[PDB]
Symmetry: C3
Subunit: 83 residues, 3 copies
């Protein structure tokens, strides 16, 4: 027998991509809501990252400085946001 | 400039990939509602014991070998400890 | 904070993204059947020499710089060494 854990993100619609940084913060592209949300390790409350003008964001990555990169699928671009 | 096709089998619309420190490769096998992994060396493919996935879309693995999946069809994010 | 747009060119439905320890950004340019990368500080992307992709959906990179891609339309996973 095994255990899987549902992360306490809220109000997701068609989540499309996930990244995890060195601190254990989890970042998710909430595709159907045109937004990117995150949850700190231990934290109970998701925060919405201040990207703008997203259309169907499809993927997310985070580098060693905590910069977050997102593929903005509907706008044919990749956007990044410093920590 | 030679690419190598990995010995995964039975994939249907694979949607995401992650690789851990040991070189194990994890794939969200979206059309089969599962996540599979391929062990380095042995090339043994196993299905990760997630349950109730619907069109999983993205996967990540952290330094502790915890696997995170976006369970797209169920509007949730799930993880599985090593 | 204010977002920055990376100087990729000609993307069509980019589907996935990874960044390695060197800050190189790798993107699956799904609608163009290709994978592109941008070195930190560069303004000119390079197209990785994969072959025969059909709607690549996700990308990962390991510590040796090997790039892994889910080639969604061909139900396979391919890799290319650095």
């Amino acid at each position: 027998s095994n255990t899987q854990t549902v992360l306490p993100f809220t109000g997701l619609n068609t989540p499309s991509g996930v990244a995890v940084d060195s601190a254990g913060t989890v970042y998710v592209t909430d595709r159907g809501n045109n937004r990117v949300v995150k949850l700190a390790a231990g934290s109970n409350t998701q925060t919405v990252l201040p990207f703008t003008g997203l259309n169907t964001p499809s993927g997310v990555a985070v580098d060693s400085a905590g910069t977050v990169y997102v593929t903005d699928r509907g706008n044919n671009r990749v956007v990044k946001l410093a920590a």
